[PDB]
């Protein structure tokens, strides 16, 4: 038909096919999920395992963007770091311009501003990764924003993305989480990992936890092996 | 980069035939030449009656004693007058008077051409209708999107544009007076015209020695009442 | 090629033009906004689909100035592209021509971005529709839309989205029978407006209502509050 | 076609890389041979008519003092290389002082065979790949060597190599007469042998031309005295 | 920039031809007749008018002829939008000579001059070429009277006598039949070329209106360009209308 | 069909063929395997001949003192980025006056290689790498593909027939660590040879190696070195 | 042209029946017509599993009478109705798409492309009704001059097993058309309502003129 | 138009069903026609590899009655209803994909072409299945009008020649005729449960 | 894995009954077609398949009795019949063979199975030389007896019986022009099998 071939180019139902395609990418990547509370904000990552050749600590997926800020990505591994040191140079920026960290509503906006700049030309492409980003502050608190490849931001008391994130979704819902500290959260965030995988296509994994928050003081911070193992045991205690 | 208009097998352009196939579907839009004046009639029809008449208005001036009309798409049409505008600032930045017609048609013709040329962008979709007061002499002036200027006593533009030139050519001549020159554009815009005829229908304007000036509504319907 | 790129079509239309205006209704949301004497209004509806959904975050009203409202009806990928640049806008009249931008200037820089697009092939056009309210010093009250082609014109009423034609009928019935025109008033037909089409009877968690007065110039969104008080108030009627 | 220069196959490959070394089958036949004693280059001058003078043709061309090359495939696109491989090749010595290894002779020219391209280039930039194949010659340091490149700018130490059009059953004759310890005189023997059975004409004195480096002697270019003295021998 | 929207007009035919420039002469062949000629005491060029309608104004000059500068004059036949471009391009051209040279541009440099510049259009760019094809006239210095001819694809000629657009076939097998080289000045080149004009002009009733008639000759050192009026060119039809029947 | 022609047109699945097809062209290189262990690092790369009278192409290029790679891919690919590589190690002793780290070498691979991606009418560098380097936490084994993805790896085989090379590196894993500099020789050579034909199995002509270490700088060894270590190893 | 005023009377009322036409064939027959093969296809009659005792064998020797298969011919009552009535109606459904193709135009067509596609498969489904208005007239030519020339040979008995062949065809085809019957009352009601929306306003009217 | 909720809830019901036929169809009757044409072919009574008990060696009057062959006739008693039996599952698979076809719309139609192949393969199968009945009947009346023209004309020969021909090549087309049912149900049963996620889920899930 | 119901048992009568026609297809297409192109070979060097003279045999006509057909053809129709059903099986498998082997294809164009759909379009013109020359079995006898009939209608017609000699002629150059088909049958089937049977999928999970 030739309509979905270029970005600047419309549908005859007036919708751009590149950008859903661009979606359809980010299906197939790990499930990454996260969830904000009055203590803080939760994450968590499916990292599996490619081969037992790699190094422990290899293919990280907790991005950093800045103090008070991470993020977590779900796609084109490519075009995640273009994006994580561009919202870098976003966050930095921002503090050469007016001093302190940028807010996280206001990250938020400037880097979706520039994923949808490049669905607009034909001479580019948009990009194919998704992600979120937390961020805590004692003037604003915890504050959890999913950018999806369209270059739109939502606000989220959690959210889930990669292959499973509907069926995610609903667990967060059956129960309350604003309450919850990120001590008893982080419980839930590796239980809900466990549910996610099952042994059918994929075959091993890590769990890659961060947290920030009352606990980390305010700074993104990833989650120690010590607590992590002990965070796991709570989740070994079930499975069912 | 790459020019959008090229030659054809039998040698016309392309591009610019559908452009002029686009205004000859526009608003329908007369005007007539007579004697000391020039008289603008066209057509200001709105869908419904939540449109604001005083918000847009399709009869612009270029100057004081310069004034336009256009039948085509309405947002080539903003540029036309922003450049053309601008031309006749940059006109009195450096001769420091009013712009002669012929030459204000002539330098924004050629930025039709322009775009016949230049790649990565389409002709403007408009077909403008210039009146300019001059040395006492009346103009009446019609460009094109390809870019051709003319010149007509009596001319007609948009749906039906036919009809209202053999029309014109019947009953119009010459000693015609300003007075008999708007009574003899609103006959012509009658036929052209259906339904009923109010002053929010139609937005006239004329242009004498002292310059181009746009008719108010409460005028119109003096005109409307088949007096003069 | 007419109906990959913007280039006339042999009837020396647009389609990219028209997939434009066909790209309003893939959003699924209806706005209207009444211009009233002494007021200007906007009622759009507040889709919340998701529970984790947070309500704070998802607004569809926007605020380019002190004194103008701004809502967006189509894509809103687009919407909020447009209204950042709107912004970019309204602040350079300011820093160049000193005070603040009336709406008609304001649709019209907007209109005229939208012509770039138009007429250059390289950049697609955007598939959003503004709507803007204000008040003018001058003339009044002043309620605007500007739609992805450039056209705007002065609107006594705007209507936009899924319901058009049916909206506008309805707006009809109060214009040609020349009601009084006031803050509750045009509040009593905004609601009734899109209550009546969708058959739903809104609740004010459901909606969001921005408003603006010659007493409060400040563009502000009714609390749930009181558009409750609003809302019973006008049922009660 | 439907394509850019820079579009991959569903294999992987550069279509324009792949037409560039089919192009060379059309060129002219030259073979060089490396031995202990120097390098020995030779091509023919294919002349299809008395009128031509053949002083115009020159086909080994010489980069430096002890650096020789050889010429083939698309003759438009080599005059552009020998001209850029001397300037290099005299930037070494107005930087380094001394005389460039033939080895970074290959690599400073094998360096512009894949710039090319369209988008974000300069106006100084290829739309089209090397036609041409290309032999350096030369004794330096560690003695004499002998060099080859291809259109897609990949370089290999060689004992012998042919090109052009006959290269196909040159390069698989120089296996059969290359052994061991031959000297110069013996290679430059074996050189007309192969060359006088793959070339279509009559083997003449004014026919080819034959140039050797040695490293007791500059790169020297056998004039018709010597070459009537050399073609005697067969 | 995607490609298949690149008619790449810079491709050869397999004869070896431009599409692009073949397709630009033929939209010239529709032009109107326009005509010049090479005499002693002057040049003369003449033209029709194919634009007729009762409505029409034409209260300036010429349709097809310009002038180029005091010393030149030209006509024109093809598309008038890139005709004004053309008309535009040659003044300044020839107004930068009078930068440089300070002198009357001589009638070689001025038409090299263009032909430069549509052959530098046809050769990349990749825009479309010109569909104009023009006359030249005037006097200079070293050649005198000089009468040119340019075709679209940048080459170009001198003539004693051509003709361009409708009829140029049949108007130029009438000039190798009565035209004498060196000998018709410019008084019996005036009523030569309306003789060709009536005969190859298979519209009837031939006026004033719908032909043009200028001149262009040097008097006591000065260049004298003048458009015959209305009222002169009747004369000239009282005066072939006698020499056509009687 | 018709999205293959570029890299910015996405596939209705949301695919990019041109991306594939510069994957596979790393396939049609040389195969070629390193290892490290908790000292030392070996590279073992395999030379091919263009021809029996022609010498074998170089697969190893020097970086830093601590640092060494492995090419497989376009030859002249990986040379425009070799010239961008070892710009950014000359780079980090001009400005930092420290070896770069690996890791971060590697990293700003990868952006060399974002940037031709998402622009129309810039190819992707089809070329892959296989590069190591020692720093103060150890050597390091980084793997890097022209889709621009880059891995942190223990030992890594690329190339053609590689699985039966990294199916030795799995059995063999726990041994990588705890062997010593001549043993990670062994275990190299030995690795090499599941990717190898047949017939033509080892020589010290086509076939070299290179070495890093604690307080070793890395160094390339060709033919004299070479032997020895073929030398008591049993295939 | 000229017309008189009733010309147009003459294609409102025309309009206005051929809408409730289509309108009644969409909403009553489409949907009923569906469980009616469907019962009839699953009904004793045209669900017996067993086609060698629905064979008519006649004997090949005052010679005994000839007549038909009884079973093929009665079965028809369910078939051949449902075959006239659907290709009626289908007709009316073309008439109907047909008769809301706007003034042709040369861009902007894609309301219509929706209709020209929809009318080639409705189309198709009536050529394929037609095939089955060949078969069942077909079965009687075929099989007459099949019997008759069975019955003209007594020296090659196997012509009464191809006439059986006939017959296996003949409830085959009896199966098979009243499956492919219901299968297009079910393609045209998918494919009519789904795209209804598009047939109905195959163009928005929105021209500026 | 106005649409009737229940007409939709008619034909609602109708896809159900078509949906738990195709369920029993794909993970029962496709597998188990493959096992049963399997033990067909190896049954003794299809395959043979002597051909000599298919000889016709007519003799050419006052004449008689003519049959058939009955090993050939017989063996076909199992081929038909096998073809008949295919058909109607061929057809179940094809109605099925006419309502997990999507609307009619230019564009997102790549990806689905394989749920095109499917129907297209079964159309050439149900090309090869009306040829296969078709010369079951063209044996009958092949081998009829040779023994015919050989009642009229004894004085040729040639006619025992053809219908020892036509009982030999029938029985050979007999086998040939299972392994393509039979292998039509493999290819079939092979494509739709490998590609079973996106043909009954082209968009995925709503 | 599906979502419908599948038994398990009858999902296995698949299993077995694919690797019955992966572990048959190969063995019939690198050892079955490759032994029987030699075998092929001995078959034209027979005398009986190499034959350049047809003058032997002559049309055994009285013409009023039976004539029956021709003793000598017939016996080389018999050596014929296992190649005929043979190579038509051979068609067969290998045609369900390339389509089993094809494996999960999602979008896109892959070269390999192209090439397999290419394999398939090549074996329709052997199945279309197949089912033609298999019916010219019993045609080579139908036309034999309407020619002995024509004969019989016109026996002073001397066309008839110089037809019947030539169609005999026509008959056994058929048959030999086709051993040579079916040696290039088993030739080009086994050289696109020999040449690349790689590219069918993109191995190496």
Not at chain 2, 1 to 10: I, V
Not at chain 2, 35 to 56: C, F, H, M, P
Not at chain 2, 123 to 139: D, H, K, M, Q, T
Not at chain 4, 216 to 228: A, D, I, R, S, V
Request: charged share 25%.
């Amino acid at each position: 038909t030739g309509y979905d071939l270029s970005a600047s180019t419309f549908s005859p139902d007036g919708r751009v096919f590149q950008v859903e395609y661009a979606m359809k990418a980010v299906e197939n990547s790990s499930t990454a999920i996260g969830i904000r509370c009055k203590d803080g904000v939760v994450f968590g990552v499916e990292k599996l395992v490619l081969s037992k050749l790699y190094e422990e600590g290899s293919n990280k997926r907790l991005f950093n963007v800045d103090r008070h800020v991470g993020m977590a990505v779900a796609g084109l591994l490519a075009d995640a770091r273009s994006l994580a040191d561009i919202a870098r140079e976003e966050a930095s920026n921002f503090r050469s311009n007016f001093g302190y960290n940028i807010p996280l509503k206001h990250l938020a906006d400037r880097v979706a501003m520039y994923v949808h700049a490049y669905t607009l030309y034909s001479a580019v492409r948009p990009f194919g990764c998704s992600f979120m980003l937390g961020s805590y502050s004692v003037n604003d608190g915890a504050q959890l924003y999913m950018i999806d490849p369209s270059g739109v931001s939502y606000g989220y008391w959690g959210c889930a993305i990669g292959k499973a994130r509907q069926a995610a979704k609903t667990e967060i819902e059956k129960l309350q989480m604003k309450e919850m500290t990120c001590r008893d959260v982080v419980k839930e965030v590796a239980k809900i990992i466990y549910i996610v995988h099952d042994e059918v296509k994929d075959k091993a994994f890590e769990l890659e936890l961060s947290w920030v928050g009352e606990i980390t003081n305010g700074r993104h911070e990833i989650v120690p092996k010590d607590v992590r193992e002990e965070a796991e045991k709570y989740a070994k205690e079930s499975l069912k | 980069s790459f020019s959008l208009t090229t030659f054809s097998p039998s040698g016309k352009l392309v591009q610019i035939e559908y452009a002029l196939a686009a205004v000859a579907g526009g608003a329908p839009s007369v005007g007539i030449k007579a004697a000391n004046g020039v008289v603008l009639a066209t057509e200001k029809k709105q869908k419904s009656i939540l449109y604001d008449e005083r918000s847009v208005h399709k009869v612009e001036p270029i100057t004081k004693h310069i004034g336009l009309v256009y039948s085509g798409m309405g947002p080539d049409y903003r540029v036309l007058v922003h450049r053309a505008r601008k031309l006749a600032q940059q006109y009195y930045l450096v001769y420091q008077e009013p712009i002669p017609t012929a030459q204000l048609v002539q330098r924004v013709a050629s930025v039709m051409q322009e775009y016949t040329q230049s790649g990565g962008v389409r002709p403007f979709g408009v077909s403008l209708l210039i009146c300019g007061w001059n040395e006492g002499r009346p103009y009446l002036f019609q460009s094109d999107p390809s870019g051709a200027y003319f010149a007509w006593k009596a001319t007609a533009m948009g749906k039906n544009y036919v009809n209202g030139k053999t029309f014109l050519e019947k009953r119009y001549n010459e000693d015609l007076e300003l007075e008999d020159a708007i009574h003899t554009a609103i006959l012509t815009l009658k036929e052209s015209f259906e339904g009923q005829m109010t002053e929010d229908n139609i937005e006239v304007g004329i242009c004498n020695e002292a310059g181009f000036r746009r008719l108010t509504p409460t005028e119109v319907k003096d005109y409307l009442a088949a007096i003069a | 090629f007419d109906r990959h790129i913007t280039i006339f079509s042999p009837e020396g239309r647009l389609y990219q033009v028209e997939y434009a205006f066909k790209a309003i209704n893939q959003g699924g949301l209806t706005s209207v906004a009444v211009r009233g004497k002494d007021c200007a209004v906007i009622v759009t509806q507040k889709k919340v689909p998701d529970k984790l959904l947070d309500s704070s975050t998802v607004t569809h009203l926007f605020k380019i100035t002190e004194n103008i409202g701004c809502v967006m009806t189509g894509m809103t990928a687009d919407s909020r592209s447009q209204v950042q640049r709107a912004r970019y806008e309204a602040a350079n009249w300011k820093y160049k021509y000193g005070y603040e931008i009336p709406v008609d200037m304001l649709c019209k820089r907007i209109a005229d971005i939208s012509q770039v697009y138009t007429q250059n092939a390289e950049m697609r056009p955007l598939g959003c529709c503004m709507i803007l309210i204000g008040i003018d010093e001058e003339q009044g009250p002043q309620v605007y839309k500007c739609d992805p082609a450039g056209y705007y014109c002065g609107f006594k009423a705007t209507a936009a989205g899924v319901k058009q034609t049916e909206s506008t009928s309805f707006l009809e019935k109060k214009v040609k029978k020349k009601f009084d025109w006031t803050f509750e008033q045009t509040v009593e037909t905004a609601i009734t407006c899109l209550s009546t089409v969708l058959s739903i009877d809104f609740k004010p968690s459901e909606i969001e209502v921005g408003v603006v007065t010659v007493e409060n110039p400040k563009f502000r969104i009714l609390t749930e509050a009181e558009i409750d008080a609003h809302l019973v108030a006008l049922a009660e009627r | 076609y439907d394509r850019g220069v820079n579009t991959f196959s569903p294999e992987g490959r550069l279509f324009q890389v792949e037409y560039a070394i089919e192009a060379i089958k059309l060129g002219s036949t030259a073979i060089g041979i490396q031995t202990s004693e120097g390098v020995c280059l030779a091509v023919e001058k294919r002349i299809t008519s008395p009128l031509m003078e053949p002083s115009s043709i020159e086909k080994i061309v010489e980069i430096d003092a002890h650096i020789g090359c050889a010429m083939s495939g698309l003759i438009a696109d080599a005059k552009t290389l020998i001209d850029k491989a001397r300037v290099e090749t005299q930037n070494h010595w107005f930087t380094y002082n001394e005389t460039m290894t033939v080895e970074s002779v290959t690599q400073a020219v094998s360096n512009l065979a894949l710039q090319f391209g369209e988008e974000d280039a300069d106006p100084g930039a290829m739309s089209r790949p090397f036609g041409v194949a290309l032999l350096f010659g030369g004794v330096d340091e560690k003695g004499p060597q002998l060099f080859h490149m291809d259109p897609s700018g990949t370089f290999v130490q060689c004992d012998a190599r042919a090109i052009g059009s006959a290269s196909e059953g040159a390069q698989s004759s120089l296996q059969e007469v290359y052994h061991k310890s031959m000297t110069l005189k013996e290679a430059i023997k074996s050189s007309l042998i192969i060359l006088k059975q793959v070339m279509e004409e009559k083997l003449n004195a004014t026919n080819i031309e034959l140039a050797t480096v040695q490293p007791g002697q500059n790169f020297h270019m056998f004039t018709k005295e010597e070459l009537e003295e050399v073609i005697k021998d067969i | 920039m995607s490609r298949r929207y690149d008619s790449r007009t810079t491709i050869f035919s397999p004869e070896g031809r431009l599409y692009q420039v073949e397709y630009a002469m033929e939209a010239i062949g529709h032009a109107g007749t326009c005509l010049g000629i090479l005499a002693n005491d002057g040049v003369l060029l003449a033209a029709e008018r194919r634009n007729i309608h009762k409505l029409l104004d034409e209260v300036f000059f010429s349709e097809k002829i310009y002038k180029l500068n005091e010393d030149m004059a030209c006509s024109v036949a093809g598309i008038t939008s890139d005709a004004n471009v053309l008309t535009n391009e040659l003044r300044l051209i020839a107004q930068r000579y009078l930068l440089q040279y300070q002198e009357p541009i001589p009638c070689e440099q001025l038409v090299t001059a263009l032909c430069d510049i549509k052959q530098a259009y046809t050769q990349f760019g990749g825009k479309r070429p010109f569909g104009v094809s023009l006359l030249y006239i005037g006097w200079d210095k070293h050649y005198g009277f000089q009468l040119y001819q340019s075709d679209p694809s940048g080459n170009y000629g001198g003539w004693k006598a051509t003709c361009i657009g409708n009829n140029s076939a049949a108007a130029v097998s009438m000039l190798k039949q009565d035209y004498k080289e060196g000998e018709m000045t410019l008084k019996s080149a005036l009523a030569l070329a309306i003789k060709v004009l009536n005969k190859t002009m298979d519209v009837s009733k031939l006026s004033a209106e719908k032909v043009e008639i200028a001149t262009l000759t040097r008097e006591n050192g000065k260049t004298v360009i003048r458009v015959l009026k209305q009222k002169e060119v009747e004369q000239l039809i009282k005066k072939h209308e006698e020499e056509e029947a009687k | 069909n018709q999205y293959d022609n570029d890299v910015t047109v996405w596939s209705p699945q949301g695919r990019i063929h041109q991306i594939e097809y510069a994957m596979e062209a790393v396939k049609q290189g040389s195969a070629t395997v390193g290892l490290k262990s908790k000292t030392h690092a070996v590279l073992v790369a395999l030379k091919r001949a263009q021809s029996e009278l022609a010498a074998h192409q170089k697969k190893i290029l020097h970086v830093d003192n601590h640092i060494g790679i492995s090419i497989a891919g376009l030859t002249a690919d990986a040379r425009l980025l070799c010239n961008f590589m070892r710009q950014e190690c000359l780079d980090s002793r001009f400005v930092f006056d420290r070896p770069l780290p690996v890791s971060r070498l590697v990293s700003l691979i990868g952006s060399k290689t974002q940037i031709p991606t998402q622009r129309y009418g810039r190819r992707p560098y089809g070329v892959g790498l296989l590069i190591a380097g020692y720093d103060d936490m150890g050597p390091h084994i980084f793997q890097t593909c022209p889709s621009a993805n880059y891995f942190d790896c223990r030992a890594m085989s690329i190339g053609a027939r590689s699985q039966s090379a990294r199916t030795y590196l799995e059995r063999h894993m726990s041994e990588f660590m705890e062997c010593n500099l001549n043993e990670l020789v062994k275990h190299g050579l030995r690795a090499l040879r599941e990717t190898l034909p047949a017939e033509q199995d080892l020589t010290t002509k086509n076939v070299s190696i290179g070495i890093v270490g604690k307080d070793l700088e890395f160094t390339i060894y060709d033919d004299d070195d070479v032997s020895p270590f073929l030398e008591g190893l049993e295939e | 042209v000229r017309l008189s005023g009733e010309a147009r009377k003459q294609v409102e009322v025309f309009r206005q029946n051929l809408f409730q036409e289509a309108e009644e064939f969409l909403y009553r027959f489409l949907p009923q017509k569906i469980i009616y093969l469907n019962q009839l296809l699953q009904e004793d009659s045209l669900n017996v599993a067993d086609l060698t005792s629905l064979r008519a064998p006649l004997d090949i020797p005052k010679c005994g009478f000839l007549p038909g298969n009884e079973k093929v011919l009665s079965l028809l009552a369910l078939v051949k109705p449902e075959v006239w009535t659907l290709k009626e109606k289908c007709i009316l459904v073309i008439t109907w798409i047909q008769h809301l193709i706007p003034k042709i135009e040369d861009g902007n067509d894609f309301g219509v492309a929706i209709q020209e596609k929809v009318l080639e498969r409705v189309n198709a489904v009536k050529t394929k009704v037609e095939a089955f208005q060949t078969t069942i007239s077909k079965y009687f030519s075929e099989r007459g001059d099949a019997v008759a020339k069975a019955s003209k040979e007594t020296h090659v008995m196997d012509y009464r097993a191809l006439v059986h062949e006939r017959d296996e065809a003949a409830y085959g085809e009896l199966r098979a058309m009243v499956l492919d019957l219901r299968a297009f009352y079910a393609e045209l009601y998918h494919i009519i309502s789904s795209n209804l929306e598009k047939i109905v306003n195959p163009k928005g009217e929105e021209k500026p003129s | 138009l106005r649409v009737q909720p229940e007409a939709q809830a008619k034909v609602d019901v109708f896809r159900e069903d078509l949906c738990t036929k195709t369920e029993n169809l794909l993970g029962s009757y496709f597998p188990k026609k493959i096992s049963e044409l399997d033990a067909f072919l190896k049954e003794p009574a299809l395959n043979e590899a002597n051909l000599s008990n298919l000889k016709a060696p007519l003799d050419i009057p006052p004449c008689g009655p003519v049959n058939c062959n009955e090993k050939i006739v017989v063996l076909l008693q199992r081929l038909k209803p096998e073809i008949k039996d295919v058909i109607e599952q061929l057809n179940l698979v094809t109605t099925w994909l006419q309502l997990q076809i999507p609307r009619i719309e230019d564009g997102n139609n790549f990806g689905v072409a394989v749920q095109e192949k499917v129907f297209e393969l079964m159309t050439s199968l149900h090309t090869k299945l009306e040829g296969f009945h078709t010369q079951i009947s063209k044996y009958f009346s092949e081998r009829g009008d040779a023994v015919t023209k050989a009642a009229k004309q004894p004085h040729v020969g040639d006619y025992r020649q053809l219908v020892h021909e036509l009982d030999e090549a029938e029985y050979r087309d007999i086998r040939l005729m299972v392994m393509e049912i039979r292998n039509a149900y493999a290819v079939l049963y092979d494509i739709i449960l490998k590609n079973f996620e996106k043909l009954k889920k082209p968009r995925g899930e709503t």
